[PDB]
Design a protein around this ligand. Structure first.
Ligand SMILES: C[C@H]1CN[C@](C)(C(=O)NC2CC2)CN1C(=O)NCC1CC1
Length: 130
């Protein structure tokens, strides 16, 4: 229905605004664009599903996310990729991991304060009906 397409358009506006607020934060610079294979050639031998904030905006615009849960699966993948690729004790790995955990925790905290729980339940019930 037209009502349903209006629901999904509001979801996209909300996701673009959360993603923009993450992308301008200086702590999250190394998560804003895909890893360059001609700077880190080993990356794609270890990490089987790369993800970054520029790819997330592209996915919003392609109508890939029908719920906030499917968006948070990609924010979780950005954070889990960094914990797996940079697991060592040295300061450079520990700084990347601390920033990855902060990106994940910031996304969840914005959504807890700003997403209405009945708006998410509506999106889940439309998705299940298709
Ligand atoms: C995920 C981040 C952090 N971990 C990596 C291994 C790294 O340390 N890369 C060193 C800088 C070449 C890979 N990576 C990037 O390449 N980000 C590129 C920024 C977005 C433009």
């Amino acid at each position: 229905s037209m009502q349903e397409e209006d629901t999904f358009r509001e979801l996209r506006i909300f996701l673009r605004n959360v993603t923009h607020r993450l992308a301008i934060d200086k702590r999250f610079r190394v998560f804003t664009k895909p890893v360059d294979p001609d700077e880190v050639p080993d990356y794609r031998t270890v990490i089987k599903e790369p993800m970054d904030l520029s790819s997330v905006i592209s996915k919003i615009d392609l109508h890939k996310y029908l719920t906030v849960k499917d968006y948070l699966r990609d924010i979780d993948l950005i954070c889990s990729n960094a914990l797996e690729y940079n697991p060592d004790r040295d300061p450079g790995d520990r700084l990347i991991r601390h920033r990855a955990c902060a990106l994940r925790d910031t996304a969840y905290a914005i959504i807890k304060e700003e997403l209405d729980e009945d708006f998410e339940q509506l999106c889940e019930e439309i998705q299940e009906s298709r």
